[PDB]
Ligand binder design. Structure first.
Ligand SMILES: COc1cc(-c2cccc(N)c2)c2oc(NS(=O)(=O)c3cc(Cl)ccc3Cl)nc2c1
Ligand SMILES: COc1cc(-c2cccc(N)c2)c2oc(NS(=O)(=O)c3cc(Cl)ccc3Cl)nc2c1
Ligand SMILES: COc1cc(-c2cccc(N)c2)c2oc(NS(=O)(=O)c3cc(Cl)ccc3Cl)nc2c1
Ligand SMILES: COc1cc(-c2cccc(N)c2)c2oc(NS(=O)(=O)c3cc(Cl)ccc3Cl)nc2c1
Lengths: 318, 318, 318, 318
């Protein structure tokens, strides 16, 4: 028997007997993304091109942002869209907190390459007035999360304590359908993805995890150099065919490029529920403690071996 | 002053004062697409998942077929699905042979990695009954070509005499609007793409060109990798932003991969009309003669320069 | 601000500190309706004309149905499309009997006429192995009922205890947005409606009331005879402007021709919760104690003024 | 086989051997009707009511227009929504003049009732610079015409030389599927149609015809009454179910109510062409000589036999 995303959140919701906030949250959440696909595949582009007579990295926010402030179950909402933090209003408050990237893969969409909404639904901790500090928290506290990847199709994977369930998106009616009941990532990939363009800047470490795949020892067989561009786009695929996403340190900074607050943590939290790791290099992406709500971070994620085989190397040159 | 594909391939019709067999290929084909275009976002997935009780790599094949078997401007069509020649019916005879790669990078859709639809439009020469041969012509005689990119959005590219333009699929009115006029790529891009996993079967003419990007000879910023995996998607970015795609020989068979008539042939064309070159290495693509509708070949195309730098590094090992 | 149907259901649900069976309930209906429209508007229509290579009274039903067993809150269901009462299975069963017309207009849909779906939500009172007996209930024992409409656009009105509320269906994302709050109704209207030709069997009041409008005794602006014939559309109209709707008695049966449990029971519970009136002519509809689930009844309704106006005459002929 | 509105006319175009404005004309229109289609089902109603962070007539009029002129097929454009007439710029000219009622059902599109579009097409008559004088022409003079009704579906009924052919919208891909290959109306109909409140301002004739059916002169089945008000919503329903359409003079005045050029003559051409009858009860609708745009008229239409009855009874009260 079937199950719409907007419903299993009702069931589990009952199943736990809380406030209801989280519910509206998800359903708020959900509808926010259905409203971004519409703009994602260029909605009525017809009008803005002259089919009657007489800007995307924005709607995607101007929507979610609103969907939650207005959701009524929020206090402090972060985002790779505002240098400073947004604080819900006295009337529109709720005991939850949200971090997120409204649309990763952004500018790389001119070439219609796949993008998607990423997010972290952490929980507030004190009676102190909510504030940007509320977000400042370690991945693990995460009370739920997941992301929406609008690519070939419009899949939105959800990631709660009860695991992770794949809810495809029949766009013909306007509702998600559960398609991949409670997941878990394969054991060993046979694909490794990391932009290999800045190899010069790659420490020796990385160097060989790429040179022990291309010219593996056990005279096995060479993984793939696949890597699209957007994280949302790769990560996922990696949790399907299995594999490994590498995005480490170099010239720029030791903390690499990628953001911790919203682009990392979330995912790190999905690999870990599907049974995958997520070491930062010296520890776990989900354990690290936040300084600035835009803090940067390095991340390696993928199957158990494609990171234990990894971590193994990384130390050798340490 | 707004315009839709139909109208486009409508207008050019007049200037030419013809017979109506091109404008009805193009049209009748634009339709089969919007369909695959809705069959990919998992149109009505619900219905087949429980909602009321009780395939692409295929559902798509048809759509072009039947839509072409009934255009009447077709004589004999070939596909990445039906082996020998689909020899059109006496009643639906046309003066053009279509060579199409229905759904590209399809088998990698479970992952929602964008995908496209490739297609080359030629014309019969002989007088003799229509068979595989009538479609054994080289992409230099092509009179029409392009493809559709089923990604974050949907864009199709229509190449022919005059030039190249892209149309956007406003999913709210099933129509394709030309978004850019007579587009051309850049001279020397900053991107390279190819499965860098078979680096260990690679042939030198290429093992230099690679070390020739990550570690350029004049301390100038290194380019950037990226290789979505499903061609159509990859090639496209290579267009919009410019750069170089490569899918060379190795040890699979210097036949390499990518299909001639309906994968390489058309892609070279477009490229070649937007100011680029698409070479096999030992000669430009749109020359290489066709023996069997299923002949492969290795192709490197895009921003002319890279293609050139490349074409160069080649000989240094010949 | 901004509201949907699915989150308004949630906000009431919250404020009511309920059990969680209703909110889930109405969420399983909403869904089925949403999946219906796509069919009414001939979704996979051309696919039928083999564009790729190749009965609604039911499907709808089948939907509201199934999705309704699956809402985990039902024990007995009844429709204009299922002879005997349909008893839910042990597991799934839930404290809410529901009745409904899977789609009123079905027949003359060949004119592509405005149609819909009705639904009477009764809470089971007695206590035994769920059987129609409970389905055997009058309109006033209800806690929810109403409808959704198929016409120019898609609207799903929902009236309970709190009030009427209309939710439009955005074809871009698939969700119902609140279009007009606590929908009330004109004390009077200038629009009466009914099957004008059956004046052959018009019991005095009727034929009279008729000529009480066509030619008003007080020289008033003669009413409009807008008869659509297909409940939904008809009814709904009245709510937006006002007037009077009737499907009277005669040689047909001293009891209309519209079943009572799911075609007058709900609709009544709406005309009433909006500020209007409903009647059988002798008595008030909702106050009828239903015998055979498929019993009928004459139904008069619309703005008060007009009803009681008629009603009066009903006595001048008693 | 299959058929799309576009490929129904592109086929017709070939044989025809004409210019191509017509094809471009219709096509451009076809698209114009799709453009509105979405709009009708309140395509973005989610954005206008808040979901982001913050009247239909003119839009539907704006449309058709900016594309008709932009179809390089027009010249003199008449419309129910522009005082006089609009004269295509000198540069975007054509030969065919077009009369269309952008959207009918506008002062009744609150209750959401079925509203559609009707249109006629005359080929320029004067070598004189495009003015209304030009558009002034008899309905017979019509080169083409037809309509599309936004009902349970967005169907299209196109009237041409051939006959009349229908098209139902598949809002998933976006096309007009040929559904009922060329139609004709019944010989006998059993459903009369009209606003019977204007019963006080009816002339004895029109009056008595309602009488012979309200109560047969030969007690065989007593005709059924229907009437949505909306011009298209009915004539159509008439064409599928046999019946008769009346809207003669009354209190307004002995001339009519419905505009000739676009709310009659087209529907007139349609009725006849398919295979029925048309009259003003003063002479064949179309044949009427124009004396100005908004020129109303008395209109009886539908099935021969019934359009025919009315007549013997019309030359009676005379
Ligand atoms: C009908 O849908 C309902 C009913 C109840 C609920 C709770 C207590 C008593 C009663 N009668 C109902 C819910 O509680 C919650 N709590 S929640 O924080 O939103 C939540 C949502 C989910 Cl995805 C998973 C766990 C939790 Cl913790 N959701 C509900 C949804
Ligand atoms: C397939 O697309 C085509 C091909 C030809 C066309 C005309 C002459 C010779 C050849 N080879 C083709 C057309 O001519 C026309 N002429 S037209 O004025 O628009 C037209 C449209 C229609 Cl609805 C019916 C009759 C006529 Cl008259 N449309 C064409 C569309
Ligand atoms: C509806 O608009 C028209 C009118 C005519 C057409 C042709 C001959 C005479 C006249 N009077 C009209 C067309 O011919 C064609 N020929 S065609 O083979 O489809 C074609 C399409 C295109 Cl992209 C470019 C060149 C050619 Cl060759 N299309 C037409 C469209
Ligand atoms: C959105 O998630 C929630 C939370 C709670 C709920 C109820 C009590 C305590 C707490 N903490 C939560 C709900 O109660 C209900 N009750 S209900 O039966 O579904 C309901 C729905 C509606 Cl339209 C109107 C009245 C009622 Cl009676 N729905 C809930 C949904």
């Amino acid at each position: 028997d079937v199950n719409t995303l907007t419903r299993f959140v009702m069931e589990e919701g009952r199943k736990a007997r809380g406030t209801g906030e989280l519910t509206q949250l998800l359903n708020s959440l959900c509808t926010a993304v259905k409203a971004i696909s519409s703009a994602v595949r260029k909605a009525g582009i017809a009008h803005l091109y002259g089919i009657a007579g007489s800007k995307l990295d924005v709607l995607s926010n101007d929507l979610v942002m609103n969907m939650l402030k207005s959701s009524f179950a929020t206090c402090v909402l972060v985002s790779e869209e505002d240098k400073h933090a947004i604080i819900v209003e006295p009337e529109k408050r709720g005991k939850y907190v949200v971090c997120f990237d409204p649309l990763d893969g952004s500018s790389n969409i001119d070439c219609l390459v796949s993008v998607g909404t990423i997010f972290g639904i952490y929980r507030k901790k004190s009676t102190d007035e909510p504030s940007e500090k509320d977000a400042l928290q370690p991945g693990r506290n995460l009370v739920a999360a997941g992301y929406a990847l609008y690519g070939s199709a419009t899949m939105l994977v959800l990631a709660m304590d009860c695991g992770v369930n794949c809810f495809m998106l029949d766009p013909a009616i306007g509702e998600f359908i559960l398609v991949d009941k409670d997941v878990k990532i394969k054991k060993k990939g046979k694909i490794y993805s990391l932009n290999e363009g800045y190899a010069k800047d790659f420490d020796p470490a990385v160097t060989e995890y790429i040179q022990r795949k291309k010219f593996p020892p056990d005279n096995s067989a060479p993984y793939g150099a696949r890597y699209v561009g957007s994280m949302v786009a790769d990560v996922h695929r990696t949790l399907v065919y299995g594999g490994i996403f590498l995005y480490p340190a170099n010239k720029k900074s030791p903390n690499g490029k990628l953001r911790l607050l919203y682009e990392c943590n979330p995912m790190a939290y999905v690999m870990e529920k599907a049974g995958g790791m997520a070491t930062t290099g010296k520890e776990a992406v989900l354990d690290v403690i936040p300084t600035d709500i835009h803090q940067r971070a390095p991340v390696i994620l993928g199957s158990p071996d494609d990171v234990l085989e990894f971590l193994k190397v990384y130390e050798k040159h340490s």
